[PDB]
Design a protein around this ligand. Structure first.
Ligand SMILES: O=c1[nH]c(CS[C@H]2CC[C@H](O)CC2)nc2cc(OCC3CC3)cc(F)c12
Length: 189
């Protein structure tokens, strides 16, 4: 309920560092990583996994989880560490595809100064998030919850909406506890 948390700094010699860095560096090799931190919020983690369980019973053969990037301002880090991507933080996200939290497949998307806004020290922030993309469709700005999969059973909704169903670039999650901010990357130009 209180959703307290811990910030563990990974040594660059830690395997975990090599993995997160490896993925980041697919599109952001010209940037300079200063630290990667793991975020441990047991309440949030339990909450996240609770949803993952009920989604893994519904979507049959679908791989519901993805690891996607999300940039934000220095001044949002404590709110996200504690609360995740709850409903108040979606008021500060684009509406082009709906009113939820936006997650990019590639780290260069998030590495934009609109999203990973450089701080007073010129340091930029991008989370490497676990997100339940599940079953998804094309999106639009007017949405506040995802569209109905079945018009004949419209209380069963899509999990997320994307820019492009067959070749996605970003994903929009609308529900609380549908993403876990596992890793935080800190870097400069
Ligand atoms: O990484 C992202 N972070 C974010 C959060 S921005 C953050 C900036 C400081 C503010 O206080 C909180 C909100 N939004 C995004 C949106 C995206 O798509 C928006 C266009 C398709 C319409 C793609 C992205 F990669 C991202």
């Amino acid at each position: 309920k209180q959703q307290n948390f811990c910030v563990v700094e990974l040594l660059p010699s830690d395997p975990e560092y090599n993995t997160v860095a490896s993925k980041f560096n697919q599109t952001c090799s010209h940037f300079r990583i200063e630290k990667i931190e793991r975020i441990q919020n047991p309440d949030l983690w339990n909450s996240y996994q609770a949803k993952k369980k009920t989604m893994d019973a519904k979507n049959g053969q679908t791989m519901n989880e993805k690891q996607l990037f999300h940039g934000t301002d220095a001044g949002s880090v404590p709110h996200v560490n504690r609360n995740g991507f709850n409903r108040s933080y979606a008021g500060k996200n684009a509406v082009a595809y709906g009113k939820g939290t936006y997650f990019a497949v590639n780290a260069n998307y998030s590495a934009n100064d609109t999203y990973s806004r450089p701080d007073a020290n010129g340091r930029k922030h991008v989370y490497y998030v676990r997100v339940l993309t599940g079953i998804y469709t094309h999106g639009n700005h007017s949405l506040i919850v995802p569209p109905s999969k079945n018009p004949q059973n419209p209380t069963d909704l899509y999990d997320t909406v994307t820019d492009n169903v067959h070749h996605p670039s970003l994903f929009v999650a609308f529900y609380d506890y549908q993403a876990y901010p596992e890793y935080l990357i800190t870097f400069r130009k």
